[PDB]
Write a protein that binds this ligand. Structure first.
Ligand SMILES: [Mg+2]
Ligand SMILES: [Mg+2]
Ligand SMILES: [Mg+2]
Ligand SMILES: [Mg+2]
Ligand SMILES: [Mg+2]
Ligand SMILES: [Mg+2]
Ligand SMILES: [Mg+2]
Ligand SMILES: [Mg+2]
Ligand SMILES: [Mg+2]
Ligand SMILES: [Mg+2]
Ligand SMILES: [Mg+2]
Ligand SMILES: [Mg+2]
Ligand SMILES: [Mg+2]
Ligand SMILES: [Mg+2]
Ligand SMILES: [Mg+2]
Ligand SMILES: [Mg+2]
Ligand SMILES: [Mg+2]
Ligand SMILES: [Mg+2]
Lengths: 49, 106, 49
RNA sequence: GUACCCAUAUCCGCAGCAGGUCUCCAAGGUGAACAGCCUCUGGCAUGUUGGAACAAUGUAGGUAAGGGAAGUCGGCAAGC
RNA sequence: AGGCGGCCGCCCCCUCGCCCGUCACGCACCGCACGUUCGUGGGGAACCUGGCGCUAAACCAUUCGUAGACGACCUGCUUCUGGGUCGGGGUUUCGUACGUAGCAGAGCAGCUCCCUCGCUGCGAUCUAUUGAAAGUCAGCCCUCGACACAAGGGUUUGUC
């Protein structure tokens, strides 16, 4: 889903600086990645095999 | 292999959504027949005239949002169909709908 | 989510952000409240209590 | 001469064709009204098909922040 | 885009694995073509036998919505942390339900204890119960609360 963030912006040389800026911000749930396999590749003169 | 009788509170307001006005109360009864066929298992479903009145009591497009029903399963005789069982859905009235769940009626 | 295949500073990357407020309002409609305790403290007792 | 239809199915139009054809009887409410809308007597099964889903395009209908004709040959249509 | 080659040690034999000389035979098929080759050539369907192994997966049906014109695509299914239907809450949407009570209510009418805001009746609304009532997933969240269901089916698919 998506939420706001009230964020302090430390970017000098702008109207944006030293003020709070609300930005549209997505949330992506990322469970941990369980490792199973290993794949090897050979550089062929037609590509990758 | 039984002759059992249960009760349900079918939610017609969420079994009908996005359906037009002139074809709403028939889709209510098609969905009641499909719900009876799914629950009690037999394809033969007979619904009563009291349940007909209870569905069609408020026109074609103001279908009531929930109806308490009682599903009995009986056997068929006298040169019967290949489906020997049939679900006779009957209507039982109740004032309120909250805290009412599925009851096996003796 | 893939790592960027090129390297850029551009004053767009590597800024130590300061998150201040992330709203968790009712996204199922118009959100009025932040937390459940704050909603109960604003409204008060009902028939359920 | 005396039946029957007298019609979105008994007439004419090549047809059970949104076309055409002359008359009498007329209820209750709102309403100035035989206006429009809802009921009664009296008729009907939606007009030569049903079922499932609600894609583009279309045909009818309704809206839309701010501008208000800047579009267009022309305020055409729609709306006040 | 790999499969034959090289080394060590054994295995049953060869001391003709070859060049020159002697001897005699094998079809000498009597003039005739497509003969000799990497062929135990390529793949498919079956026949009898030895040894070593294998015991599945798609498609339909049902459900699903993250996708859908129809096809197509992402999904669930077990007898236990399985799904489905109700119910319960969480959220939200509108705005305070019916009923009851009121020395609230513009006022009006009637009665006699002759009633020192007397009582009764009509009466748009208002107040208290009331942030009430009602809907809430069908394309929202959690439920191990109550019922039932679960391997129940049809079609097809092999490499000397
Ligand atoms: Mg006559
Ligand atoms: Mg006609
Ligand atoms: Mg004609
Ligand atoms: Mg006509
Ligand atoms: Mg009248
Ligand atoms: Mg009048
Ligand atoms: Mg008249
Ligand atoms: Mg007709
Ligand atoms: Mg037609
Ligand atoms: Mg028909
Ligand atoms: Mg506008
Ligand atoms: Mg506007
Ligand atoms: Mg103007
Ligand atoms: Mg002008
Ligand atoms: Mg011009
Ligand atoms: Mg005009
Ligand atoms: Mg307008
Ligand atoms: Mg009401």
């Amino acid at each position: 889903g998506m939420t706001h963030i009230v964020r302090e912006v430390d970017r000098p040389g702008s109207k944006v600086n030293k003020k709070e800026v609300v930005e549209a911000v997505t949330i992506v749930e990322t469970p941990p990645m369980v490792v199973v396999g290993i794949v090897g590749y050979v550089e062929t003169p037609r590509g990758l095999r | 292999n039984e002759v059992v009788t249960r009760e349900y509170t079918i939610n017609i307001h969420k079994r009908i959504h996005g359906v037009g006005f002139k074809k709403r109360a028939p889709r209510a009864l098609k969905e009641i027949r499909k719900f009876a066929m799914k629950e009690m298992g037999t394809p033969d479903v007979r619904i009563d005239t009291r349940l007909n009145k209870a569905v069609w009591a408020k026109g074609i497009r103001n279908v009531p949002y929930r109806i308490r029903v009682r599903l009995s399963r009986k056997r068929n005789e006298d040169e019967d169909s290949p489906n020997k069982l049939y679900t006779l859905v009957t209507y039982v009235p109740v004032t309120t709908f909250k805290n009412l769940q599925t009851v096996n009626v003796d | 989510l893939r790592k960027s295949l090129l390297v850029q500073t551009k004053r767009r990357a590597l800024e130590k952000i300061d998150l201040k407020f992330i709203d968790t309002t009712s996204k199922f409609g118009h959100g009025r409240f932040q937390t459940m305790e704050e909603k109960k403290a604003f409204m008060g007792p009902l028939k359920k209590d």
